[PDB]
Amino acid sequence: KQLSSKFGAISSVLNDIFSRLDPPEAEVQIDRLITGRLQSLQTYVTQQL
Amino acid sequence: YSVLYNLAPFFTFKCYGVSPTKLNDLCFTNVYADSFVIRGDEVRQIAPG
Numbered sequence: 627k628q629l630s631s632k633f634g635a636i637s638s639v640l641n642d643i644f645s646r647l648d649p650p651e652a653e654v655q656i657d658r659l660i661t662g663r664l665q666s667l668q669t670y671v672t673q674q675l
Numbered sequence: 676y677s678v679l680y681n682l683a684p685f686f687t688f689k690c691y692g693v694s695p696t697k698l699n700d701l702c703f704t705n706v707y708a709d710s711f712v713i714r715g716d717e718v719r720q721i722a723p724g
Contacts (some may be wrong), residue, residue, distance in 0.1 A: 646701060
């Protein structure tokens with residue numbers, strides 16, 4: 627279910643971001659997306675530990 | 676959009692949002708075409724927020 631979240635972005639699909647928004651700002655958009663998913667993965671890994 | 680790029684001497688995409696040269700590659704729908712005439716420096720007033 628964490629993949630359905632937007633994490634402040636305009637879309638939850640990265641292909642839509644790449645084919646919809648300009649790459650200079652799509653870089654910071656994907657940076658926000660990857661860091662949100664990385665925080666979720668870190669939380670899951672700590673819970674698993 | 677290719678013919679629209681050179682039918683008129685309009686300003687070369689001074690706006691934020693969709694990618695400039697990718698407009699032939701999206702599948703958008705439900706567009707709105709509102710036209711009006713203003714005076715001088717009121718173009719900067721027309722912006723999100």
